Amino acid sequence: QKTPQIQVYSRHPPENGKPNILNCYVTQFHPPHIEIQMLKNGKKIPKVEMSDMSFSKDWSFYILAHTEFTPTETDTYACRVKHASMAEPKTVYWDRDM
Amino acid sequence: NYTFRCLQTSSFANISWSRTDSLILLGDLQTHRWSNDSAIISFTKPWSQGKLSNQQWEKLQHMFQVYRVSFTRDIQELVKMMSPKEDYPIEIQLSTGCEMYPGNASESFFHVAFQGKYAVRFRGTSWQRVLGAPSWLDLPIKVLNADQGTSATVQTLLNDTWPQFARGLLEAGKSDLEKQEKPVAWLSSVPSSAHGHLQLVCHVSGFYPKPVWVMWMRGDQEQQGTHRGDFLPNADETWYLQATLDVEAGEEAGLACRVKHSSLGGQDIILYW
Ligand SMILES: CCCCCCCCCCCCCC[C@@H](O)[C@@H](O)[C@H](CO[C@H]1O[C@H](CO)[C@H](O)[C@H](O)[C@H]1O)NC(=O)CCCCCCCCCC
Numbered sequence: 001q002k003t004p005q006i007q008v009y010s011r012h013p014p015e016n017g018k019p020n021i022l023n024c025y026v027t028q029f030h031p032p033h034i035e036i037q038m039l040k041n042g043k044k045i046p047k048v049e050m051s052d053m054s055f056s057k058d059w060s061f062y063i064l065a066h067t068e069f070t071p072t073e074t075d076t077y078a079c080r081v082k083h084a085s086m087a088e089p090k091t092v093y094w095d096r097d098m
Numbered sequence: 099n100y101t102f103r104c105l106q107t108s109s110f111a112n113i114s115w116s117r118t119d120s121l122i123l124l125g126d127l128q129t130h131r132w133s134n135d136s137a138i139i140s141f142t143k144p145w146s147q148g149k150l151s152n153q154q155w156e157k158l159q160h161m162f163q164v165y166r167v168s169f170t171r172d173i174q175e176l177v178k179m180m181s182p183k184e185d186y187p188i189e190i191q192l193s194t195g196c197e198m199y200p201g202n203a204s205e206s207f208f209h210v211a212f213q214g215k216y217a218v219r220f221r222g223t224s225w226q227r228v229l230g231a232p233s234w235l236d237l238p239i240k241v242l243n244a245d246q247g248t249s250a251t252v253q254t255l256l257n258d259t260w261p262q263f264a265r266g267l268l269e270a271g272k273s274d275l276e277k278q279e280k281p282v283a284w285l286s287s288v289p290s291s292a293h294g295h296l297q298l299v300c301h302v303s304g305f306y307p308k309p310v311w312v313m314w315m316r317g318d319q320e321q322q323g324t325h326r327g328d329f330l331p332n333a334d335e336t337w338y339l340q341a342t343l344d345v346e347a348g349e350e351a352g353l354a355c356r357v358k359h360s361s362l363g364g365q366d367i368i369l370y371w
Pocket residue numbers: 104105106161162164165168169172173176177192194210212218225238242245246247248251252255
């Protein structure tokens with residue numbers, strides 16, 4: 001059992017009110033069974049696409065979630081991951097400055 | 099150099115329940131998809147047939163179809179008979195392909211991970227256990243090695259199919275593999291827990307191909323404290339990368355982020371704080 005690492009980042013320079021794409025890249029987890037949701041204001045976004053489950057040369061799994069979003073002054077965005085290596089879901093919030 | 103690779107992930111949970119999913123990649127571009135839900139291999143690129151005519155691709159394609167059903171029942175039979183532990187759950191990862199060297203030179207491989215760990219390889223004519231793998235795997239390995247019909251097929255894969263198919267893929271997708279997409283840079287900073295300290299971040303997204311050079315500069319001088327993050331993928335198979343520099347308060351003024359990429363010619367991106 002290995003714990004997943006979560007990285008959240010936007011495709012383009014974030015600018016409030018302009019449509020963008022938010023990515024959530026999840027790595028290092030084992031076994032490959034995993035649940036990944038992307039959240040807007042703690043609410044789960046409906047149209048979230050996933051890449052095909054792959055893994056690196058060292059056998060570390062990795063998978064890309066992404067969805068369209070329009071960054072804003074008020075809204076929070078987060079990626080929530082559930083995996084048997086963790087007692088609780090891990091949520092990492094999007095922060096355009098990180 | 100490009101690594102051609104078929105990556106298979108297989109999960110056996112209880113006596114009824116298994117699924118096998120796989121994809122094929124050439125370098126960092128995906129060329130094929132095979133979900134457990136589909137009966138047949140999909141293309142994910144226009145050139146994913148490489149140079150095979152239809153007849154030969156269909157032969158390779160049917161070969162995959164028989165294998166997936168054969169593979170699934172084999173593992174469960176092998177593990178049920180010889181695993182000194184319970185025969186579920188089983189996680190198998192599988193990587194076979196060849197590394198492409200310029201000038202028509204290749205090097206094939208077939209690697210198998212068992213419960214998340216490198217366990218088996220295929221060299222010459224036989225499967226071989228690797229250092230560190232559970233010793234009891236010796237018995238299923240010997241049983242698999244008595245199947246010379248399968249051994250011969252794998253030999254043909256490693257000696258002929260993968261090198262020749264991937265050379266045709268490489269040339270049918272040369273334009274895609276060599277397209278140039280430009281990076282786009284933007285800057286941000288985050289506080290440190292300590293006062294007077296903060297961390298500059300230079301975000302660089304959208305570039306292809308992958309090799310790129312991102313540094314924090316003060317004029318001529320490279321700031322050696324620059325920390326390059328990991329290459330992160332974008333949905334359009336461009337790349338994302340950020341580089342960070344911890345600086346004392348006030349030192350940010352006059353610092354720039356310099357981006358060297360093959361898509362820019364010699365015109366570096368220079369983006370001052
Ligand atoms: C305990 C944990 C062990 C982990 C180690 C894993 C070892 C590597 C995986 C072995 C994969 C092979 C699996 C199928 C093979 O067991 C055999 O039944 C089939 C069909 O075999 C029958 O039908 C054949 C004709 O269709 C032929 O007559 C055989 O003699 C007969 O026994 N073997 C095959 O399908 C040969 C194809 C080799 C696989 C190439 C596709 C792999 C590509 C993966 C990306």
